[PDB]
Amino acid sequence: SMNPPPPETSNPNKPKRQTNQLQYLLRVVLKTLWKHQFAWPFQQPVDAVKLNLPDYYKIIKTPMDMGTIKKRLENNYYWNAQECIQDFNTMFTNCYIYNKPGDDIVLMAEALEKLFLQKINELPTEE
């Protein structure tokens, strides 16, 4: 009957940077996925109360979504590109853990993940 608080998106004491790689992760990677026709189920934390999935946050213990990633990038929350890439991978993996192969939600994640991988293949060299 309860959703957890969302993942952290603000922390003044956290070491953080703007790098050219992190800029690419916002301007290219996040922007490309966000505009996709299948983005919407991933644009905010899963509301497991509204979806009637009482097991969701009992099974998915490291939730992640693109709304959170977008805020983190906009706030320059990350230290490096790998931290942000990990958030995307957590989001995709969580989808495949929770759902059945071939479910619509899985097909949607797979389309986003394909694009993600194509974009990160061209992640620029740092600095």
Ligand SMILES: Cc1cnc(Nc2ccc(N3CCN(C)CC3)cc2)nc1Nc1ccc(Cl)c(NS(=O)(=O)C(C)(C)C)c1
């Ligand atoms: C990120 C994410 C990961 N996993 C799941 N899993 C999930 C599993 C079973 C359901 N239900 C269960 C019983 N219902 C009658 C059918 C769907 C919903 C979501 N959702 C996610 N987001 C999400 C957000 C908003 C909505 Cl409306 C949905 N619904 S949906 O998946 O059915 C679809 C997008 C295909 C319409 C999903």
